[PDB]
């Protein structure tokens, strides 16, 4: 029966060993006999947990007699790939990768249970990467269970001049690619983007402009992947008109059936007449391709598995349906197997299907035996005049050091709108008043500098109507080299000191009219337009007095839909915001009726540049395409300062500078 064997008590060295005890322990032993088997501290075991549900797996850290005279054992828990935040969703296979029914993670978590609760003894071994072939396998043969890692419920952490190549996927304009690279630079690491894959021809345009050296790819992620696999195989062997200079390689395409095609050059035919041709038709000229593949390899035009070092996320999640892009992403990661993986995405991941996708990523990363951790981070805390909360998923090899989330650099107050499914994923200060934090910016700080321009400004480049008027403005107008862009290496980047992309949306005349009409007061919105009234619940209704006003065109003041938004209310629609405050999230679509996008004093709505400043975009950074598309480009971008912070932490991880683990990190200047 459950008696305390193991000889006398701890003798009261115990209270030094276990101060908290003196649920308070009135005595302490080194061993216990339950049933007829005997165990001692440090043993591995199975605890009987609740009714018809699993058995806690545990390590014994304590044997003591409660003041009750009841006999307890305190054990530190082992977590099953389920019990972790990734619960269920253990089923995912990725490229023949799966969880291993006997594998666990050591939790610093502890609970005390009466002894009868002990089923029997496990044998739980532990294994490190450095064992390598069989050395693990022999053990895994021996053990009932094994663990290589530790699970911390915070951030769901699964945790045990140099040059780094980066691959960015779904990168428009390269906001995150860039910021990451900058931070990395500060760390002392040189992180250069050697490839970027994006669908939008424009975002590609912009990226290429600002990162001339990176290899931009205008294609779907999938294609790029399949093309990757072939590119590997074909890369191996290196192998009715006369061809020349195959200039291009692509898998899939617009109409193209799946397969490899080459951009071709025919002798004396000129750029026009260059055609994408299927691999087969080129059989007649193998040497051309052999040549092409040859340099291409030396040039590393396409990545091979050992080559990718760090890689960027961002797959849009719009389960099986529009979620596909993350599946594709993780597949990429699988084929390439880089050292580091950084994935950004919206918050809903953890809110939708009860956090289905957050765990899809987490798992896919872990079943791949990557150390993984994650956190939610608000853009504002890092120096932007906006509150934008995004999810960042870290992963790294076991050969490497898991990065960590840089804490808020600014005083922005976080309301913890964190999903439950992950409750403690938020990188925030907790109340420790490290007020050595800067003042949360408002719009004025960002944009007070910019020269005054009208609704129609059709000039990508215009000079500055002023001088940096604030710390921030001082900051964002800085040479590529004053930050460390190194896109151009040693030398000055193009578009020196010029102000670029300062343009608003061109409003169809009448809009120009409603907007012109607005008060330029502080709180101005459509309610100031001459149709105004109130209701028990505030509902804009027409004042039953004035006749409907018509513009200098055949149009009204166009309340027509405005009147009903949130069924009324919604002071948000046509109306100004101002330097006095922040935009919660810069969005992809500039248009007044629902958005409160309107420049405080200018009657033009907000120019893209402004929105970019808001997004932390360094000014030297250019963009391309029509307005409406530029807008999107910046609307999608990760706040560059945030990416910069992550870039730094990552730099340190990669270089190996770091400290005994915990979720978040710090930095001086940065």
């Amino acid at each position: 029966e459950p008696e305390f064997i193991g000889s006398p008590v701890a003798a009261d060295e115990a209270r030094s060993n276990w101060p908290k005890r003196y649920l308070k322990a009135r005595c302490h032993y080194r061993s216990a006999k339950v049933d007829n088997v005997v165990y001692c501290l440090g043993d591995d075991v199975y605890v009987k947990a609740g009714e018809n549900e699993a058995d806690y797996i545990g390590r014994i850290t304590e044997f003591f007699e409660g003041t009750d005279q009841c006999h307890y054992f305190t054990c530190r828990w082992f977590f099953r790939a389920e019990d972790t935040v990734i619960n269920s969703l253990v089923s995912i296979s990725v490229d023949g990768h799966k969880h291993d029914p006997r594998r666990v993670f050591l939790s610093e978590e502890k609970n005390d249970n009466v002894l009868d609760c002990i089923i029997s003894k496990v044998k739980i071994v532990h294994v490190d990467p450095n064992m390598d072939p069989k050395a693990k396998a022999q053990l895994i043969e021996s053990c009932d269970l094994y663990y290589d890692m530790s699970y911390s419920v915070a951030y769901s952490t699964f945790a045990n001049t140099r040059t780094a190549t980066l691959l960015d996927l779904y990168s428009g304009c390269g906001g995150m690619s860039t910021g990451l690279c900058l931070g990395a630079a500060l760390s002392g690491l040189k992180l250069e983007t050697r490839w970027a894959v994006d669908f939008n021809s424009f975002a590609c345009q912009s990226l290429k402009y600002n990162h001339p050296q990176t290899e931009v790819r205008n294609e779907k992620a999938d294609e790029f992947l399949a093309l990757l696999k072939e590119w590997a195989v074909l890369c191996k062997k290196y192998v009715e008109f006369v061809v020349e200079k195959l200039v291009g390689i692509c898998y899939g395409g617009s109409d193209r059936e799946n397969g490899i095609y080459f951009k071709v050059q025919w002798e004396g035919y000129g750029p026009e007449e260059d055609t994408w041709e299927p691999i087969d038709n080129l059989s007649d000229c193998p040497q051309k391709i052999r040549e092409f593949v040859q340099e291409g390899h030396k040039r590393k035009i396409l990545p091979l598995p050992g080559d990718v070092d760090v890689i960027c996320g961002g797959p849009p999640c719009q389960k099986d349906e529009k979620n596909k892009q993350m599946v594709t992403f993780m597949d990429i990661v699988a084929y390439l197997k880089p050292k580091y993986v950084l994935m950004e995405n919206v918050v809903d991941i953890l809110k939708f299907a009860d956090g289905y996708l957050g765990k899809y990523a987490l798992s896919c990363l872990v079943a791949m035996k990557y150390q993984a951790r994650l956190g939610m981070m608000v853009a504002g805390c890092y120096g932007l005049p906006q509150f934008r909360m995004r999810v960042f998923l870290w992963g790294a090899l076991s050969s490497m050091v898991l990065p960590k989330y840089p804490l808020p650099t600014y005083d922005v107050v976080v309301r913890g709108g964190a999903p439950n499914a992950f409750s403690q994923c938020m990188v925030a200060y907790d109340e420790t008043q490290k007020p050595s934090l800067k003042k949360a910016l408002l719009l004025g700080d960002a944009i007070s500098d910019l020269p005054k321009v009208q609704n129609h400004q059709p000039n990508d480049v215009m000079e500055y109507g002023g001088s940096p008027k604030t710390e921030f403005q001082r900051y964002i107008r800085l040479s590529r080299k004053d930050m460390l862009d190194w896109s151009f290496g040693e030398g000055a980047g193009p578009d020196e000191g010029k102000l670029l992309d300062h343009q608003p949306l061109r409003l169809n005349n009448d809009d120009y009219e409603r907007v012109q009409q607005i008060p330029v007061k502080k709180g101005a919105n459509f309610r100031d337009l001459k149709g105004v009234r109130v209701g028990a619940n505030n509902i804009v209704e027409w004042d039953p007095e004035i006749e409907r006003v018509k513009l200098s065109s055949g149009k009204p003041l166009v309340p027509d839909y405005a009147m009903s938004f949130i069924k009324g209310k919604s002071l948000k629609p046509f109306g100004r915001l101002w330097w006095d405050e922040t935009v919660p999230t810069v969005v992809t679509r500039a248009e007044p009726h629902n958005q409160v996008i309107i420049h405080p004093t200018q009657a033009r709505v907000l120019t893209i540049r402004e929105n970019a400043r808001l997004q932390g975009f360094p000014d030297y950074y250019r963009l391309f395409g029509p307005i409406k598309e530029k807008y999107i480009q910046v609307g999608n971008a990760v706040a560059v300062p945030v990416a910069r912070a992550l870039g730094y932490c990552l730099g340190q991880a990669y270089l190996g500078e770091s400290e005994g683990s915990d979720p978040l990190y710090q930095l001086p200047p940065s």
């Binding site: 009715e240 008109f241 006369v242 061809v243 071709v264 055609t275 041709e277 299927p278 038709n281 080129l282 059989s283 007649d284 000229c285 193998p286 040497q287 051309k288």
Partner: peptide
């Protein structure tokens, strides 16, 4: 050395 176009 040589190859051929497709529709």
């Amino acid at each position: 050395q040589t190859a051929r176009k497709s529709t």
